[PDB]
Write a structure and sequence with these properties.
Chain D: It is found in: Cytoplasm. The complex is a heterohexamer, with four copies of chain A and two copies of chain B. Helix content of chain A is 24%, strand content 21%. By secondary structure, chain A is α/β, with parallel strands linked by helices. Classes of the chains: A alpha/beta, B alpha/beta. The structure holds manganese (II) ion (MN) (6 copies).
C-alpha cells in the first residue's frame, strides 16, 4: 500500500477544504477591536462578519454553498472559502437580508446550532425565518424583522430598513456600533429610498451589490449606481461586494474608482470608494482613505 | 432528522467541494479543438490543461493543495478549485516543471493512476520522477527529462528547455502542437535565456509567473519582466499566472497592460498581453487580441 | 429715432429667436440622403428629425417649450439648449411623432405649425394619451393614428415600429424606424429594462438613442453611463448615442463617462457597438459616421 | 378658437424666449454677497455679471445677439448657447462695460434696455471705438467713460483697471476688477501675449478669464488649452477659467483639454493656479469655489 | 610623466568630443534609401539631414554651437549632445539655412563643407543668410538667395522656399519635394494662418515644427496644441516636434502632443499622426509613419 | 584668409566643449546649503555631486568618457552632454567610485583633481578601484580602499560603504551618505537585490538612487520601472530617483513608467516614498524638493 493506492476523492476533499481552514476563524477570534473603531471581514458574496469594540460578533449573509457542479445559467463560484462555519464559536447574532439562495445557508445554520450557544438569535425577514425553522432552527430562537425595527445585540444597534407587503421578503441592515455604522444593502437594486436613509441616519461604511449584468438581466448594481448609492447614503466609504462570487457576473471594481475620479469634484462626492478582497479585514475609520485593500504580505 | 442536526462539517465539505464539481472536466472532454488552433484551460497557480487539434490532452503543474489552514509565511489560497482531478478520464500526459509544493501533487498522481489508462506517462525532471515513484507511480511509467530533451506525446511535441544541479530539478516546457505553441515557464525568474528560446523556437503563447513580491523577497516576475519575457520569447500573446494563488502575492495584472500601452510602439512589441481568469478557456489564435478574458455570461 | 429709444423687448426677441432661425430648416429641406444611408438631426432633448433616402421626413419628440422662467419642490428646471429649429418654418413633413405625454416630448406650438403650415394629410402618431392631448388642442381626430406596442405604421419608405416603454402601456411607446438605409431606435425617456434584449433579438438595430443624464441625489429619471452601454449591448446596436442630457441644467451630465467605461469594457465584454457623443443641431449619417466617436459642428473654412 | 388655430409664430416666441426668462435676473438681485468674497455669473460668450460685497453690480461684455439665422468670409457660426439673462429685466446696475468693439462683446439691445430701465447716471465704460458705437446707438455723450490702458475707474467699491489688450489703445482693453473680496481678470478676446506677465507682476490677480476655443483650420481667433495655462502662470492667478468656447458652433471645444494638460504640467512647472470649468448661467464665488475644479448647476430635489 | 600629470583639459576634450564622433556620419553615407521613400536624421535643434532615393544629400539648419558656459539674459544651456561631426562630412549636395538667428546657421559647418566637400555645393538661404556666409568666406558664386516662391532643384530633390513666421530677407520655410515624398521644415517659425496656404497648394507628408516649453512671459516656441494645429493646416501625415531638445530653459514634454491628439483626433478628423523623435535618430517615410515613438537601435 | 579656411576641426571642438562649460562648477561652489538640508547634482550616468550644510563636497562615480565614436558588440552612444568640467573643479573634499567599470571611474577626473585640488583629498572606492587610481599615478597613501561594512568620515558627511549586487567586496560597493541634513543611498550600478531591505532596516534612508534603464532583448543590465519602486520600499526611502537611463542610446527608457506604476500601487502597498524624475545637470534639495515628482531646469 502506497500513497497512490490509499488516497481517494474523499480523502483529498476532506483534508483540503475549506481552503483557509480556520485561519480567519482564529484571526477574528483574537482580533482586538480598539475603542472608537469597528472591524469587519468579507466572507464572500455578501457575507460579512462584524466585530464591535465591545467584542460583539455579528454575521450577515454568510453563505457556504457553491454554484454549478455539473452540466446535468452557468453560475460557477469563483470565490474560495475563507471561513469555516463549523469552526465558529463566539457569535452573538446570525443575520440574513433576504431568502435568495446565496444569502442564507443551511450549513451555517447547522454549524451555529451544533457548536455555538443556544441564546444566539437568528435575525431576518419572515421568509428567512420560515426557511430557518424548516431546517430545524427552533421558533423561539428566531427574530422576525420588518423595515423600521431596531434590534439591540449587546453594543450593536441593528436597524432593519427597506430593501428593493414586501416587508416579508427583504431588508437592508444598518449596524450601529459605538465606533461607527455599517450599511449592508443585501442584493438590492438601486433605489431612491437610499436618500431617505442618508437623511435619517449617519452612515459611515456602505456595502452594495456590484456586478456585471449579463445581456438582458438586471440583477446587480452598476459602477455608476455604486456612486449614486454612496451619495444618497451620505456615506464616507463605499465598498462593492457580490461581484466576487459568480463567474457570469465577473466585474471590474476599478470602474467605480475611474468614474469616481471623473465625478467627485463636479458632484462634491463626500465619500471614497474602497476595493476589498474576500477574506480581507477592514477597520473603520483607520482604512477609510486606503482606496485598495491588500492581504498581509510580510511576516510582521 | 432535522438538517441542523443531520449535517456535519464533513458532509458539508463532501457536498460543496471542489467548487466547480466536474463542470470543467465535462467542458474539456466536450471541447472540439478546431484544426489550426489549440485550446487551453487555467487550473489555478501554474496549472494548465492543453488540448491539441488531434484531441491530445496534457496536464501541466496541476496542483490540488492549499495554503495555511491555521495560525499554530501567511500564504492563503485565494483561488477556488475549478477542476476535479478524480473526474479526469481522458489524459495523454501528466507533466511537472519542478518539485516545489505548488507544482506537483500526490492526489493528482493518485487520481490519474486510478481513473485513466495504464500507459499515461509522468513527465518531469529527476527530482519530480523521484517523488512520483516514492508516492507509488511505476518507475518505468515515468519519463525523466532535462533541458534539450524532446518528448512526443501524440501530436504534441514537448520541448524541455532551461529553467531559472539545476538540470535535475527544474525545466521550462514548450508544447508544440499542430495548431500552435505554448511556453510554460513554471516558476522561473526572468532570464536572458528567454532570448535564446525565442531565437531557436517559434513561440505563440507564453505563460509567466506573475506576482507582487513582499518587501525583501524576489520570488515572482514583475509586470515589466512579463513584457521583457514576451519580447525575448518573440511571443504573440503574454499571459501572467501564479498571481492568482497566494494572498500575500496578490498583484494587479492590469500593470502589464498599462506598461504595454506605454512601451508597445516605441519598442515595437510583437506581442499582446492577455489577462486570464482561473477555470477559463483560451484558444490560440482566436483569443490573441482579446486583452481580457471574461467567463461565459449565459 | 435712436435705437436706445426705439428697440423694445418684443423687437429684440423677434429679431433674435429662435437662435438658428430657419438655418436647420433650410439644411434639412435640401439634404440629399444617399441610397443605403439615412440622415438624422438632433433637435434638442429627445427631439429627432429623420430623413430617409426617399426623402421621407419624420419628426419625433420635437419639443419647443422651455424650463422655469422665474422663482415665483421648486425645481431648478432650466433649459440649457438653444432652439436649433424653427417649427413654423417646417414645410416638408410626412409624420409627427411623440413617445409619451410628458412635458418634454409633446408640444402645442409644433402641432400648430404642422396644421397651419403643412399638408392636410400629415399623421400625428402617438400613444392613446398623446392623441387625446393633440385632439384637445385642436388637432382633427382623423389625422391621429393611436399606436400600441406591436403596431406598425408605414410612412412612405419609413417603417415605424411601436415598441414597449419602461417606467415602474397606454402612456408611453418606444420607436424603431426602419429605412432602406438602416434602423434607428428611439427609447424616448425610458428607464433601462431587460426588454431591450427582446427588441435586440426580434429586430436588427443600427443606431440607438438613450435618455442619458446626471440624476440628482435621490432621483432616478435618466439612464447612467453604464446603462447606456448595457442598452447598446441589449439592442445589438452598432452605435449608441446619448440624448436628453443636453436639455436640463439640473441633469447636466458628462457624456464622456460612456466612452471611458466603453474603453474599459469593450474587449472583455466584446461590445459590438461604438458610442457617439452628439451635439444639438448636429447631423448624423448612418453608416458614414458610425466610427466617428464624437461629432463636431461644421467649422467651415 | 382652438389652441392649434389661434397660436401664431409670434405668440410662441413671445412666451418661450429668452429661455431662462428672468430667473438669473432674480438670482443676482437676491444674492447677498458675503464680505471677503465676490460673486460672478457667466452670461454667455464673454459676458460676465460681477457683484461685489458692497452690492455693486457690474456687467461686462454682455452680448444678446445671435449667429447665422439663414443661409442667404462665408462662416457657418451658429449660437450654441441659450439665453440665461433677459437684458430688459435688468434693474439694479452700476456700470456697463465692454472690452472691445467686436460684434460678440457689445450689444445694441443691452444698451437699449439699460437706457430704458435703469438710472440715468449709470456709466458705459469702454475703449474709444466702443463709446463711438454707443454714442451712435443713442447713448448720451455724458454717460460714457472712455478708457485707455493705464486708466482706473472707481465704480462704488470696485476699482476697474483698464489694462493692455492684444490683437491699439482706441480699439481694445483688458479689465482687472478689484473688489474688497478679491480680483477678477477679464481678458476679453485677446490672443495670448507676453504682456500678461507684466499684468501678473504688477498686480495681484485672483481669478482669470481667458477666451478659449477650437480654432478652425487656418484661423487664429481663440486661445488654445496650452495658451490658457500659460496665461494663468503669467498672470499669477489662482483660478483660470475658459470662456467664449460656449458660443460658436464652429469653435466648439473641450475645456477638459485644459485640465489634462494641467495634470501633466502642474508639478514640473510649479503652477500656482487651478483650472475651473464653468457653465453658462452658472455662478462662481471667489474664493469659495476656487478648488471645485468643475461647475454643476443646482440639482435640487430634497424630498 | 604619469597619467594624472600628463593629461590636460585640452587633450581630454579632443579625446572625447564630439560625443558620437563620426558614427552618424558613417550611417548616413552608407544608407541605402529605397525607392518611393526618403530617410532623414535629427542633428539637434532644427538640424535636419535629408537623403533621397537618388542618393542626394541635403543639410538644413545644422548647428554646432552651444549655450551659456559661465555666469560672467536667459539661462539657456545646451541639453543636447553632438550627434554629427561637421568635419567628417564627405557626401553633400546642398547646405541650407532658414534664418540669420545663431541656432540655425553655423560658421564651423560652413567651413567644414568648404574644406572637405565638392566645390559646387550650393549654400541656399534667405538674403540675410548669404550675407553671413559671404562675410565668413563663402564665394558669392556658391550662394542661392531664396525668397518665398523660389524653388531650387538639387538633383531629384525639389526645394520649395515658402513664407516663414518667426521680412522675406530674414527668413523662409522649406518644403523638400523628393520622389519618395515631401518634408516640411518650418525652421523656428511660430504658428501662423499661412500654414493653411501651404497645405492647400502642396502635399505635405512629414511636418517638423519648433516645439518647446515657453518660459513665463515668453513666446518663442510652439505649444503642444499649436503642433496639432500645424499638422491640420499643413495636411501632413506625420507631425514631428523638434527644437525642444536644445535648451535647458525650454525643456518640454512631447507627450503633450500625443495626449492632446488622443482627445481630438476623432472629433477633428485629423489625417496625421504625431511622432516623438530623438536626436541622432533616423526617420524613414513612409515606413515609420505609424510608429508614434522613435527608439535608438538597441543592438545585439 | 577668411573664417572658412582658418577654422579647423580642433578650433571648433576646443571652443564648443564641454557643452555647459563651467556653469555647473560655479553653481556648486556658490551654493549655500541650508541647515537641515543637503544639495546634490546629477552629472550624468551615475555621477553625483553632493554638498552638505557644513560645506563638504563629495564626488561619486563622475564619468567623462564617451560611447562609440566610429563603427570601426553594441551600438552604445552617449546621449548626455557634459554638464560639469572636471578641470574646473577646485573645492572638493572626496572622490568616490562604486565599482571599477568604465562608466563609473575616470582618469581625466582623477587627473583634474590631482592637478588642481588639495593634496589631502582622498580617493575612496573598492580594492579594484584604488588599483586603477594607483595605476593612473595617484599616490598609494592618498587612496582609501573600502569594502562593505567600512565607514569613512569626511567633514560632516559620514560615508557608509555597503554591499553591491550582481566575492564582490573586491570590485563593488554601495554608498549611504549620512549628512547632518539627510541621508542619500547611491546603489551605483547594482541589479535589484533583497539586501536593499537589510539596508532599509539598519539605516534611515531619505533619498534613493537606482540604475534605471531599458534593457535590450535578452540583456539584464539595468533595473526596471517596477524594480525601482521595490527598491524604494525595501530601502524605506522617501524619494526614489532613477539615473543611468540618461547615458546610453540603447537603454533609452521612460522614467514616467515609475510614476504611472506608482500611481497604481501606492495606496494598495502603502508606499512611504515618492518617485522623482531628475534631469542631468539639475539640482536637488532634500527635503525641499521631496514632493516635486518632476524636475525642471531653471526657466529664468
Ligand atoms: Mn445574490
Ligand atoms: Mn510556486
Ligand atoms: Mn423627458
Ligand atoms: Mn469675440
Ligand atoms: Mn532657434
Ligand atoms: Mn554603468
Amino acid at each position: 500500500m502506497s500513497k497512490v493506492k490509499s488516497i481517494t476523492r474523499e480523502s483529498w476533499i476532506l483534508s483540503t477544504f475549506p481552503e483557509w481552514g480556520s485561519w480567519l476563524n482564529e484571526e477574528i477570534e483574537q482580533e482586538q477591536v480598539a475603542p472608537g473603531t469597528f472591524a469587519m471581514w468579507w466572507l464572500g458574496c455578501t457575507g460579512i462578519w462584524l466585530k464591535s469594540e465591545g467584542g460583539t460578533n455579528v454575521c450577515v449573509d454568510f453563505w457556504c454553498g457553491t454554484g454549478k457542479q455539473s452540466h446535468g445559467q452557468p453560475n460557477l463560484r469563483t470565490t474560495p472559502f475563507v471561513l469555516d462555519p463549523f469552526a465558529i464559536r463566539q457569535i452573538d447574532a446570525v443575520l440574513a437580508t433576504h431568502d435568495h439562495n446565496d444569502h442564507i445557508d443551511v450549513n451555517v445554520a447547522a454549524a451555529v446550532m451544533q457548536n455555538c450557544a443556544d441564546d444566539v438569535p437568528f435575525i431576518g425577514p419572515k421568509t428567512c425565518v420560515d426557511l430557518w425553522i424548516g431546517w430545524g432552527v427552533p421558533k423561539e430562537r428566531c427574530i422576525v424583522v420588518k423595515p423600521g425595527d431596531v434590534v439591540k445585540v449587546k453594543d450593536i444597534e441593528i436597524h432593519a430598513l427597506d430593501a428593493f407587503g414586501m416587508d416579508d421578503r427583504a431588508v437592508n441592515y444598518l449596524f450601529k456600533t459605538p465606533g461607527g455604522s455599517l450599511y449592508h444593502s443585501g442584493d438590492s437594486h438601486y433605489s431612491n429610498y437610499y436618500a431617505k436613509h442618508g437623511n435619517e441616519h449617519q452612515i459611515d461604511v456602505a456595502l452594495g451589490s456590484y456586478g456585471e449584468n449579463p445581456r438582458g438581466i438586471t440583477d446587480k448594481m452598476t459602477s455608476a449606481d455604486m456612486l449614486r448609492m454612496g451619495e444618497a447614503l451620505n456615506a464616507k466609504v463605499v465598498i462593492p461586494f457580490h461581484h466576487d462570487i459568480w463567474s457570469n457576473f465577473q466585474a471590474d471594481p476599478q470602474e467605480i474608482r475611474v468614474l469616481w475620479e471623473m465625478k467627485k469634484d463636479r458632484l462634491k462626492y463626500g465619500f471614497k470608494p474602497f476595493i476589498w478582497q474576500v477574506g480581507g479585514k477592514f477597520t473603520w475609520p483607520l482604512d477609510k482613505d486606503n482606496f485598495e485593500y491588500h492581504y498581509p504580505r510580510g511576516f510582521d
